[PDB]
Amino acid sequence: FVQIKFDDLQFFENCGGGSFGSVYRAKWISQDKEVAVKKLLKIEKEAEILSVLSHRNIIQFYGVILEPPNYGIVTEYASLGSLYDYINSNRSEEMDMDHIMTWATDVAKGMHYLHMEAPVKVIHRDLKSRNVVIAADGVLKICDFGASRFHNHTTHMSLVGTFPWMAPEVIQSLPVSETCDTYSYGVVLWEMLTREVPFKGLEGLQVAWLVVEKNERLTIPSSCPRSFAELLHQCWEADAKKRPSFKQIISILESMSNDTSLPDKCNSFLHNKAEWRCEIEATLERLKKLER
Numbered sequence: 470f471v472q473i474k475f476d477d478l479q480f481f482e483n484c485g486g487g488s489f490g491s492v493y494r495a496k497w498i499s500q501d502k503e504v505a506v507k508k509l510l511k512i513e514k515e516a517e518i519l520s521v522l523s524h525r526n527i528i529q530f531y532g533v534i535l536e537p538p539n540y541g542i543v544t545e546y547a548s549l550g551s552l553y554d555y556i557n558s559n560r561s562e563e564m565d566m567d568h569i570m571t572w573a574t575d576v577a578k579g580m581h582y583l584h585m586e587a588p589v590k591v592i593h594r595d596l597k598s599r600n601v602v603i604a605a606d607g608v609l610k611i612c613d614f615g616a617s618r619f620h621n622h623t624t625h626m627s628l629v630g631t632f633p634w635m636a637p638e639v640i641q642s643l644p645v646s647e648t649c650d651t652y653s654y655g656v657v658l659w660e661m662l663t664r665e666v667p668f669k670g671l672e673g674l675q676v677a678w679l680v681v682e683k684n685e686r687l688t689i690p691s692s693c694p695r696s697f698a699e700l701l702h703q704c705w706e707a708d709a710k711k712r713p714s715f716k717q718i719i720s721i722l723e724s725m726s727n728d729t730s731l732p733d734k735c736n737s738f739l740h741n742k743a744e745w746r747c748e749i750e751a752t753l754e755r756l757k758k759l760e761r
């Protein structure tokens with residue numbers, strides 16, 4: 470639970486501006502290290518139980534700032550930015566099947582560590598593409614895994630914005646198991662495949678209602694390979710007990726990566742977005758219209 474003095478940080482982005490939970494690029498002066506700094510209202514000593522977690526697919530803890538009123542947590546800075554920004558940029562056109570498999574495996578692995586391998590079991594509860602970042606070598610790192618337990622206050626702002634990623638039982642404050650993260654993972658995989666914002670332009674409460682009451686799920690284009698479509702359907706089951714664990718997902722991904730037919734089918738799908746984008750847009754028009 471290393472303490473980093475506020476005076477040992479050179480901020481690139483003014484740390485005054487954002488709400489609690491905002492993250493700033495900074496330099497850790499005495500270490501000559503680029504870092505991320507998440508601004509917090511306060512942090513409890515108990516948070517030290519998570520300071521020992523370490524895995525190549527979760528963001529690496531560096532230290533804590535403990536000088537009132539300045540509180541924060543310091544981590545590694547992933548040089549390529551957030552997964553959400555990448556997906557929704559034209560840069561995502563570069564992605565082929567190998568890219569997607571590697572990144573899908575990255576997230577799955579990090580979530581398996583949190584669920585099963587860490588000294589303290591962690592259910593994320595807020596997994597989404599905005600909470601994944603891309604390190605300089607392309608390794609994906611999961612962020613905010615301790616938010617739900619140690620700084621839940623940071624999760625309030627655009628809770629509505631997050632509804633597309635939230636399992637029905639989380640939206641309803643029903644009993645929650647580790648598989649709530651499998652549901653969210655399914656949405657992240659859908660984003661990588663379609664490179665679209667889930668339920669784009671839809672009111673969050675409307676999303677939440679459709680997901681919970683009508684069993685609505687994100688549109689899977691008909692030309693999406695069946696192995697991927699099936700994985701998404703498993704992640705998205707209403708009955709949380711029937712969703713796969715991350716151990717099971719990893720095994721599914723390994724099976725898919727041995728399928729010699731898949732790369733051509735998937736790459737043809739990925740590069741065909743001009744063809745199937747209308748399928749997603751049609752569902753959105755329909756849901757918006759039916760709301761009217």
Ligand SMILES: COc1n[nH]c2ncc(-c3cn(-c4c(F)ccc(NS(=O)(=O)c5cccc6ccccc56)c4F)nn3)cc12
Pocket residue numbers: 492505506507516517519520528529530542543544545546547548549550551602603611612613614615616619
């Ligand atoms: C364009 O944006 C970007 N580009 N490159 C980037 N690299 C990194 C980041 C980036 C870092 N964090 C970031 C952060 F600073 C502080 C904490 C967290 N998580 S935590 O659960 O609170 C947490 C983590 C580790 C140990 C914990 C121990 C107890 C409690 C909570 C703990 C976090 F996730 N968030 N985002 C954005 C970007």
